[PDB]
Amino acid sequence: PPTKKVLDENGQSINGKSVLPNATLDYVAKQNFSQYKGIKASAEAIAKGFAFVDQPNEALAELTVKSIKASNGDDVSSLLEMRHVLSSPVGEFYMWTAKDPQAFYKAYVQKGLDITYNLSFKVKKEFTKGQIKNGVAQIDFGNGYTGNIVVNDLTTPEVHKDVLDKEDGKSINNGTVKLGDEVTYKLEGWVVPANRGYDLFEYKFVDHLQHTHDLYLKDKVVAKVAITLKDGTVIPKGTNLVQYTETVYNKETGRYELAFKADFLAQVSRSSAFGADDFIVVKRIKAGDVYNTADFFVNGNKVKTETVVTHT
């Protein structure tokens, strides 16, 4: 039985874990010949040859073969012929068959030397949920054997903005605000799920404040869920996360950023959820209609909130 794993940056397996739209899926697939060590196959069995099959589902796109190596270190790619088929599998798939069955049998199969295929793919931009699947099979001496299917959920992030009279107050969206008064923008972060196959290096809001009408006073960032770090420390929901963040505000452009420090985010356990809400307090200093939107970035993935309005 041939096998396939899916690996993270650190070379660890993440079969069954969730990933983000910009993931690179790094697959390691094994054509298993170690069980044939010492075999004495007949010549007609040998002449039926050897082939390895990889079948990705509709989620995956741009194949790169990064290497094909035997377990003794040999680069064997020039001994195989790759085909991409599209019409024991029966739809769309990749296949590698040995060009010279005899020589391949002697050098690799009869010696029990497994071949490892390192393949990477991207996710298609129009696959925004469900399961990313990749399966393998192998054909030896004309007999086909399926191996395992590796499965990963694709989670597209999602965020919201509201405008409030103040924190844990009420929405005033499309409402009126007296001149000189304060309002609070709430940016609702995505809860990054437990059972993910990646660590966080970026969790960040960019808010384009309408600086001609709104004066940035201050901000506050709070945990939306209990957060568990790798060493077991639990950070209660509702906790003020300020010292794990950096805020910057350019008064000439209205650009506001709040970002978590990479060193903190690295401490969060892959089996904890993670999320924060950001409250931005502004003072209304001019009459007219005041719009607000934000962008949210999680590990290089960008999404936008809705646009809110208030009137003065």
UniProtKB/TrEMBL annotation:
Organism superkingdom: Bacteria
Name assigned to this protein: Gram-positive cocci surface proteins LPxTG domain-containing protein
